[PDB]
């Protein structure tokens, strides 16, 4: 009564050592972080999977085992391969659903870092929306006209950096992501600050040219 024994102990040992490592509460706080823990529970499932097989054998032998046994022994060990199966099924569930959360995470991270670009963006086009200098001559006329021409350039550059978040939002929304709330928030302000830029620079592409 060893070999068997000294498995199901390292079996169980492995499953209680498993299910806490993916029972845990840490939340990425950063894309890095949020890579770094999809990475590891990539790995707990390979662990998962490596385990399944020897899992059976010692599932279907501790049957064999304790039938028609009688002593408190095999009684006794006999619940304690009920809690096997438990831990086991429990574990994989618990994966599953560790793995649903950490994928939000990756996507609200991925979102957060895009969605910062396209404030950041916005912010400078506010910037230049916000004043027009008076050409004090030909020469600053002339430059002034110019400079605000590459201002359009960027903008139109920067179109996509601006409007990526908005459409990764969206669709984390759509997926019923977690941080719904704060993602909703941010989608819209982007949205609604780059039509008020594109607007007032409407605007200020006249002002430029009939003044």
Same mark, same amino acid.
């Given at each position: 009564e060893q070999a068997f024994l000294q498995d199901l102990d390292d079996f169980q040992a492995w ?18 972080? !949020? ?18 097989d020897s899992y059976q054998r010692v599932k279907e032998s501790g049957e064999k085992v304790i039938q028609?046994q009688?002593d408190?022994e095999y009684?006794l060990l006999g619940?304690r391969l009920?809690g096997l199966d ?16 950490? !994928? ?8 957060? #870092?895009? !969605? #910062? ?82 607007? #007032? ?11």
């Amino acid at each position: 009564e060893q070999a068997f024994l000294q498995d199901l102990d390292d079996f169980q040992a492995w499953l209680s050592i498993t299910q806490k490592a993916v029972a845990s509460e840490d939340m990425p706080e950063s894309l890095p972080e !949020a890579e770094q823990l999809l990475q590891q529970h990539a790995g707990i499932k390979d662990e998962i999977d490596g385990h399944q097989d020897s899992y059976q054998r010692v599932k279907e032998s501790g049957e064999k085992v304790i039938q028609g046994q009688t002593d408190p022994e095999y009684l006794l060990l006999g619940q304690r391969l009920e809690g096997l199966d438990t831990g086991w099924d429990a574990l994989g569930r618990m994966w599953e659903s560790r793995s649903h959360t950490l !994928a939000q995470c990756l996507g609200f991270q991925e979102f957060q #870092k895009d !969605a #910062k670009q396209a404030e950041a963006i916005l912010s400078n086009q506010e910037y230049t929306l916000a004043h027009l200098e008076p050409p004090d001559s030909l020469e600053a006329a002339e430059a002034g006209i110019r400079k605000f021409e590459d201002f359009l350039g960027s903008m139109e550059n920067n179109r996509d950096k601006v409007l990526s978040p908005v459409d990764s939002g969206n669709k984390l929304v759509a997926e019923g992501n977690l941080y719904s709330d704060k993602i909703k928030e941010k989608v819209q302000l982007i949205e609604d600050r780059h039509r008020k830029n594109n607007e #007032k620079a409407q605007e200020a592409s006249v002002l430029l040219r009939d003044n």
